[PDB]
Scaffold this active site. Structure first.
Site, PDB file in Angstrom:
ATOM      1  N   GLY A 219       0.782  -1.217   0.000  1.00 38.29           N
ATOM      2  CA  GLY A 219       0.000   0.000   0.000  1.00 38.29           C
ATOM      3  C   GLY A 219       0.817   1.272   0.000  1.00 38.29           C
TER       4      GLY A 219
ATOM      5  CB  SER B  34       6.348  -3.512  -1.936  1.00 35.56           C
ATOM      6  OG  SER B  34       4.990  -3.109  -1.983  1.00 35.56           O
ATOM      7  CG  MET B  35       3.969  -0.621   3.044  1.00 35.98           C
ATOM      8  SD  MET B  35       5.077   0.634   2.393  1.00 35.98           S
ATOM      9  CE  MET B  35       6.327   0.663   3.667  1.00 35.98           C
TER      10      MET B  35
ATOM     11  CG  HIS C 222       7.393  -3.685  -5.848  1.00 36.14           C
ATOM     12  ND1 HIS C 222       7.081  -2.378  -5.549  1.00 36.14           N
ATOM     13  CD2 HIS C 222       6.286  -4.409  -5.562  1.00 36.14           C
ATOM     14  CE1 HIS C 222       5.846  -2.316  -5.083  1.00 36.14           C
ATOM     15  NE2 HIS C 222       5.341  -3.535  -5.083  1.00 36.14           N
TER      16      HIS C 222
ATOM     17  CG  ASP D 299       7.289  -6.593  -9.088  1.00 36.52           C
ATOM     18  OD1 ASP D 299       7.838  -5.477  -9.006  1.00 36.52           O
ATOM     19  OD2 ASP D 299       6.055  -6.738  -9.211  1.00 36.52           O
TER      20      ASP D 299
END
EC number: 3.4.21.92
Lengths: 192, 192, 192, 192, 192, 192, 192, 192, 192, 192
Positions: F67, F96-97, F121, F170
């Site tokens: 997010g 990612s987050m 990423h 990614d």
């Protein structure tokens, strides 16, 4: 969000919503577009208060731009049926149905605020279909127009012919003008 | 929102919704477009009241423009099944389905307000598909038409031929006209 | 963008689009869904060719997924009215109207490509409204089904009972199957 | 989500929503676009507090961009009818109706924060229809414009002519400028 | 879904929502786009906390991308009015209004997390209409811009001309950069 | 709806939602897209749980697809600020987050389920406007990208150069691969 | 697109569109929904053909699902005004307006195809507005219904009462039935 | 697509569209809604016909449901400005602007088909904005109403008072009724 | 579709569209909203006519509700640049740009029809963005207002102060009023 | 509908559209937004005129609100490549690309109308994606900004630093201001 208020009673502290607390004092709020669901709710409040005390007077605060006629008749018929006199007070405005309910209040107990705006017009409707069906619905709405005018003449005290002329097109009446026309009896300017 | 009310009992003060409070007095509100969901709710209310006191009557307040036939027919069969008499009062209006339930009430207990409008028409429906399927659905709706007319004649007392001719197109009936037709028995003008 | 094809005649060079040039050779194209506008255009072409030569055969190529029935009847009645023999050919596919018009060609002049396919089914329709109107429209589509099946049995040689059994649901047929079923006379595989 | 706060009383601890807790202290929150529904809520809050203590002063925080005229007049008339002096405070901004209600507060009890922005403009309206109906509706908005300007002159103290010129187009007034104009009495910079 | 927590109080145990529990500890959460409705909720919390204990400091957590200028001013003016010192903290980000409210905190009590971001830009607005009204609205947004740059210069400590140069276009300040600029006083890396 | 649970213990029985029940056991659920509102809620739980027992560990379950970055830093900064060690566990996935928060957990207390997936990423964003503004925003996101890589390198233990190359596109890492990379410390296959 | 056809004249070979070529033969095509634009185009063709030859009969092919009534009257009035006799032919289907124009052709020159279908029903209309305006539009459409039934009785030769009974609802008629009803004089099956 | 018609003259054959061919005969078609683009085209045709022969009568066919008033005035003013007498004939229906232009034709050259229907009503309009702007647009449309009624009285011969009473609401008129009302002169029942 | 007309010349017969034929007579048609494409077309016509005969007056018919200012300025600059005197005529209505171009015509050659209308108002615009950008666009539209008012005063002959007072709001003017104001020189009622 | 003009040449009368006729005079029109398709068309016209006469000056009229930069570069590079001097003239308005092409004309052959306007601003662009891709597109648009500013400084003669400061935000310029800024050379007030 509706706020909650506390009422001191012999049993002890009780919590009520702002609208329910006023309902306890025989106050019913008629607000917004008139329709079947809101009208049935108002009908339930009138019957409930009748049982509690059929002698005391009920109050109806009308601030609405009008709505369905059939839903309004349910309220009007209920007011005349129950023994308690229904006092109508106009707040902000009272359109075609709101005005019909406003003037339908008990003679002498109809009030209006000074800056209120009252408007009365004839019924509006429409139908799409065959010519035969059009003739049926066209006759029905005309009957309602005559019936509504006949009842307004009774409450307002004006002649039937005068009502037909004035209600042919939208007519706006201020609080003092309404008193002369007969829609309301007096104005509530200040607490005495 | 719905306004809460207080009921005094031996145990102490109790809080009830406006509709639930009236349900305690054997009053059921039939409002809006008839659908399966609301109909099952009315059916549940009837069965519940039957258990509490099958001798006391039940009062059904009808203000609706009609709806599905299957949903409305679940209310009719429930009314006839239960032992207590189901009184029907028309507020505002009672269309095709609302009128069938209104006239389906117990003999002598059907009432109507003076300004209420009762409209009756034949069933309407539609289907899209193959000709073979259309024949199946066309025969079904016609059978339903005869069934509804047969029952309407029984309650109103008019002949089947008259009901068929009158309900071929939309027919609006006022509260007094409904009394002569047989849809209702008396008009509740004022409390006595 | 339709291409332009030059035609050399004794008078001199002439320019025509690909479709008009073939029309000069008594070739009419039936492409896309059958509607009223395209059908009316085909009718004009047939009448035009009749005036030009009321004894030379006409060729009608059919590649369509079907469509309105009333539009197809104009084409069918026009083919059976004029004196010239309309030779129908199936290209790609032939649906309900395409198949009906295909088999409606002159006896012994109906052809079908090898990898083509034909599909026959009963009419489709529907209506939304009162029960009375449904009975009317339902009877009408049923008459169309019987009338269309009668004509199919005449052009195909099969029995009316067999057609009704095969048309109750979508039935697909290949080029050889169509020949055995009587829908077409022969398969055009190679120029000879 | 509205937070819940605990209040310590002689009877015991009680839970109140943040808005209800401030209502107990005679604080009413006017927020967002003015309309009939929120206006009736404010009216109910005013009448409720009047009954509890008609001597203590009520407070009305105003952070709104304006709205319907009729809904605002209900609040204005209610503020003038009741005995308690309504002390209006401006938080963030006060548009046409927010400003009209702000200046309508009791003389000497109208306040505004240092960075608040007040704005006054003439009424906005429109109607589509026949020329006769257009004339009818046009006269009402003119009367409302004249009636609103008369009241603004009474509270602010400015001449009627000056109010007309300044209200012809949107006029923005800072907190100090509003004091000179007369819309407010003092500025609340810091707690003393 | 918001979770509920239990507090072990002297008078038994009480259940509070996660946000209400922190409100009891003088912690207010400012999150999301600033608007009139949420701003009026923060104002209520600030006033309520002041009544409970004016000496104790109030903590405000700002994680927002900015919003309406007027709504933020209601919060800013409220903070300066109340006697207690409001300690602002920045979590995640603090845009134009979030940064203005962040720096508005009491001197020496403004904090920022190490990985937080800050963004200061001039006001954004627009109007469609006549040239005369465009000139009006244009003067106010320019006046609001000057007013916001004056207040930001006061808290940050930088010259007014410097603030104008930086605010002309979006500027991004890290947590240490904000300390040098003056938006915040210190960084909260770890608990000591 | 969430299922309610009860705790049959001394000092009375308490009913809580399943999520709140686990919160009492120092378990916070991080699920779905990261945003300001959900992140703010997690911050309150972390700060809340710290008060009861700063020595006891806090568990964070991550099943988020990633997010906003600003909202994520509000959680990361809170975890490092508080004294109790935050143990992160990956259920289903950690994008990612979610992965940045997963590796941010206390060293030796980071776990991952055997069939869970992880991906890392670089930040993605965009801006529309003048070239001058683009440079400002482009510089900001690049600074964020560099800052995030620095922190990930610290927790994982890998060099900044390796993190930059792997995060350019990614990179999907399984639970065993994550252990070697350094995102997590061990895997939880079965209870011992 | 429409195909181009070559016509040999005194000057030489001449090119025309398919519709224009048939127009020279005194043939007009009525296709699709009736409207002011298509109706005016047909009127222009009738006037042009009259000037070319005021004694040769004109042919009007009808295949349409009906449409506006006013547009149809323009075509009807022209047919009855000009000296040439307009021979009407039905292809595919003839609805309310199509059938009205079909039966309006010259006596003895009205033809129908074997599979064509004719449908006749009463006018369809609708209006929305005040009850006064409804009475006006309702009376107007009723006059049209009576006027149209009068004309249909004249051409078909059936009694006015019979036409009214058969037009109350949609009535379908095959080509043989239409001959008995007087809509058409003969059926065109084969040119031979 | 519009059909093509060949015109034979001494010079040779010439091809024209159906509308262009009729233009040579001084026949203009006013079809569809009256807008600015179509009205501008009609004006160009009037000036063109005047130049070639300023003494021959012009024919204007009207089949339109009305439209804009400003566009209509251009047509009306041009008709009166030029010397040729514009003969107005109405086919189908003639609404407010069609009837106004119809009656605006030369005295004694205004005809109407037997089944045509004329409709006259007062102008329509509306505006949304400030009260000052509303008064302006209200006075403007009222002047148009008076101006249009004055011209109608001049061409129809009726009194201004009578026209005002008959135009307050939609009034329908048949061909014979229009003759008595002075709107037209004769009826073209047959060419003889 | 535009009708085609034939122009007889010594060389032979030439076919031209209605608009092209009138263009040969130095007549231009300004119809519809003023945009960049339609305006550029009018400019080309003006230059073409100048090369043909730079001494013959040009006629420009105007019937439009106004439009863009930049597009109109190109037309105005061209009219004043070329030597031929552009005679402007108003048909139906002339809005802000339509009236500006109308009054911009050659002195003594500005005409209007009797039932025409004229409307003058100040420019309209708007912008959304930063406060700095707003000041720019606001100053620009104000210069246009002053520039356009200066030009209007020059052609009409009224004082600049009077024009500003009359252009602050929409002002409607009839043909006689425009003559007195100075927008037009005379009224064209009849050719003679 | 572009009008058609007749050109009288020695061979005989010829027919051309208004735009094509002016193309023979070496006049090109740049109207509307600058896109690839319109720019490609202009490029073809410039090359065609060069082959016809590479020594006669070309005229380019510009009335455009700007558009794509790549498309405009094709026009700019084409003008500087060919030998003929492209005289640029602005009508109505000239935006970023319109002004860039305007000032790109041959020295001493750049004109502007008296009431025209010009607007110059820096490029506008945006990209959404990974941070790496943002840096790429960001660097690209920055190079375009510098490249375009260099060219503007060359044609206008202003310093590069001055152009950068003015281009930062939208700068408006009138015809006289453009002359002093070196953007154009003279003003075409009258033909003279």
């Amino acid at each position: 969000l509706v706020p909650m208020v506390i009422e001191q009673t012999s049993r002890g502290e009780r919590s009520f919503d702002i609208y329910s607390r006023l309902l306890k004092e025989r106050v019913i709020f008629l607000t917004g577009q008139v329709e079947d669901h809101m009208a049935n709710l108002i009908v339930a409040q009138m019957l409930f208060l009748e049982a509690e005390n059929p002698e005391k007077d009920i109050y109806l605060y009308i601030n609405s731009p009008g709505g369905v006629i059939t839903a309004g008749m349910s309220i009007y018929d209920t007011m005349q049926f129950i023994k308690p006199d229904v006092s109508t007070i106009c707040m902000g405005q009272a359109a075609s149905m709101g005005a019909f309910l406003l003037t339908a209040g008990a003679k002498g107990k109809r009030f209006c605020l000074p800056n209120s705006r009252v408007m009365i017009h004839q019924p509006l409707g429409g139908y799409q279909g065959q010519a035969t069906d059009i003739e049926i619905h066209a006759r029905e709405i005309l009957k309602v127009k005559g019936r509504m005018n006949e009842l307004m003449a009774l409450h307002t005290g004006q002649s039937l012919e005068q009502i037909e002329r004035d209600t042919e097109r939208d007519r706006f009446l201020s609080a003092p003008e309404a008193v002369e026309y007969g829609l309301v009896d007096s104005i509530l300017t200040h607490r005495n």
